[PDB]
Amino acid sequence: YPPGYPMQAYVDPSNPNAGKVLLPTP
Amino acid sequence: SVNSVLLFTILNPIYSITTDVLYTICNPCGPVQRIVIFRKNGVQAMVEFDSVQSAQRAKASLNGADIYSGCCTLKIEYAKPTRLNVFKNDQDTWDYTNPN
C-alpha cells in the first residue's frame, strides 16, 4: 500500500472519514 | 438488512475505477471475494466480502472517504443481492476465489 495512506488530511469531529484520502493521486 | 455485499456509489468519479483500485482499497478492510463495477450512469460497484463483519469494517472505514484527494467520494450501503455472480476476471469484474 502506498506509504502514508490512507491519509487523514484533517480530523472533523462530526465525521471520522471526512478528510480521509485512500490513495495518492494517479 | 446487513449483508456481506456492499454497494459503493462513487461520487465525482474523476479517475478510472477498476477492480484493481477497488481491491487495493477494500481488501485491507476485509477479505474481498468478488467485485462488479457498473459504468452506465456514473460509477457504482458491488464488493462482496468473506463475511458481514468484514463488510461492516469496510463500510465503517471507508464511508464518506475519498479514494483520491478531492474526488471519488464513497457512499456505501448494503447491496440487495447476497452474493455476486461473476463469469470473467478483468478490470470490470473479478472473482478472487475463481481464477479462470
Residue numbers in the entry:
A (entry chain B): 2168 to 2193
B (entry chain A): 190 to 289
What sentences appear in the manuscript?
The RNA recognition motif (RRM) binds to nucleic acids as well as proteins. Here we describe the mode of interaction between hnRNP L and LL with the methyltransferase SETD2. We demonstrate that for the interaction to occur, a leucine pair within a highly conserved stretch of SETD2 insert their side chains in hydrophobic pockets formed by hnRNP L RRM2. Notably, the SETD2 binding region in RRM2 is distinct from its RNA-binding interface.
The conserved 30 amino acid sequence of the SHI domain did not reveal any clues as to how it might engage hnRNP L. Hence, to further explore the molecular basis of this interaction, we determined the crystal structure of hnRNP L RRM2 in complex with the SETD22167–2192 peptide at 1.80 Å resolution. There are two complexes contained in a crystallographic asymmetric unit, with hnRNP L RRM2 chains A and C associating with SETD22167–2192 chains B and D, respectively. The hnRNP L RRM2 in the complex adopts a β1α1β2β3α2β4β5 conformation that forms a five-stranded β sheet packed against two α-helices. When bound to hnRNP L RRM2, SETD22167–2192 adopts a U-shaped conformation contacting the RRM dorsal helical face. Although all residues of the SETD22167–2192 peptide could be clearly traced, only a fraction at the C-terminus of this peptide (2183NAGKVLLPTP2192) was found to directly contact the RRM, burying ~477 Å of the solvent-exposed area of hnRNP L RRM2. In detail, the bulk side chain of SETD2Leu2188 is accommodated by a hydrophobic pocket which is lined by hnRNP LLeu251 from α2, hnRNP LIle214 from α1, hnRNP LIle256 from the α2-β4 loop, and hnRNP LLeu263 from β4. In addition, the side chain of SETD2Leu2189 stretches into a neighboring shallow apolar depression lined by hnRNP L Ile214, Val210, Ile256, and Tyr257. Furthermore, the residues downstream of the Leu pair, including 2190-Pro-Thr-Pro-2192, together with SETD2Leu2189, wrap around the hnRNP LTyr257 and hnRNP LTyr204, providing further binding affinity and specificity. Notably, hnRNP LTyr257 makes van der Waals contacts with both SETD2Leu2189 and SETD2Pro2192, playing an important role in hnRNP L-SETD2 interaction. Although the N-terminus of the SETD22167–2192 does not interact with the RRM2 directly, we found that the residues from substantial van der Waals and hydrogen contact with the C-terminus of the SETD2 peptide, possibly helping to fix the conformation of the peptide and thus, enhance the binding.
